[PDB]
Design a protein around this ligand. Structure first.
Ligand SMILES: [Zn+2]
Ligand SMILES: [Zn+2]
Lengths: 145, 142
């Protein structure tokens, strides 16, 4: 402990990484960094997190889909700037650093973790039209403080 | 299992509408701009079989990589597509998506499953390959 698991967050060092749209009041009071275009928010924690962030260029991995109660292996795109249709939390807009795969994603699946052999790749962010999008974390080097 | 850039079934040739030739247009059977599809008549009989199934996995040919790739793909739907040389930004109908290489020259590559031809490469960008679904056009084998 502490591991993110299915909790909807990544815990690395003194940081907690969540979907920005799911961030709690405490997250915001504890804010480190947040970017709406990436749907990401990072808060500071007292306890030390055990998740390892992948530094690689893997395009294949496995994510947890809560709505199906299953892990799925997926091929996914490199992170890019992609138009995303409106959700409950965002208008139709361009989202940055987003990776897409074919898979099931309901709003409740957000926060599901995508992993490869090297560590945590990203978290479920978007869904619909039979695609699941993941916000990439691999470029944020400062998470490894 | 041919890849010529077109599907040949019976007396029909199925091609991307944006790649259709003058001869295709002089031979026109049906075309739909929102689907990026055009069908023309042919003199010679084609050997392709159109899949009637529900399959969401298959194999497509990517000309730019000179490779066939196994892919899982979405059910056909109405999808926003960024502007290309041939179309303005718009919603394209009956489009199925997978993760894969798709360049403009890859249009016409055929997606197949064990049952037959599923669709043809239509779109690409941000690391996705889109395929225009042909499985609903029943009249192709009628
Ligand atoms: Zn990796
Ligand atoms: Zn099939």
């Amino acid at each position: 402990g502490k591991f993110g698991q299915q909790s909807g967050a990544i815990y690395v060092g003194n940081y907690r990484v969540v979907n920005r749209h799911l961030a709690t009041h405490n997250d915001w009071a504890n804010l480190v960094w947040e970017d709406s275009s990436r749907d990401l928010l990072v808060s500071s924690t007292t306890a030390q997190g055990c998740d390892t962030i992948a530094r690689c260029n893997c395009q294949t991995g496995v994510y947890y889909c809560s709505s199906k109660r299953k892990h799925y292996p997926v091929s996914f795109t490199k992170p890019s700037l992609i138009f995303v249709e409106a959700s409950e939390y965002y208008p139709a807009r361009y989202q940055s650093h987003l990776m897409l795969a074919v898979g099931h994603s309901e709003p409740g699946d957000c926060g599901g973790i995508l992993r490869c052999q090297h560590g945590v790749v990203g978290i479920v962010s978007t869904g619909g039209n039979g695609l699941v999008g993941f916000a990439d974390v691999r470029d944020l080097l400062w998470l490894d403080e």
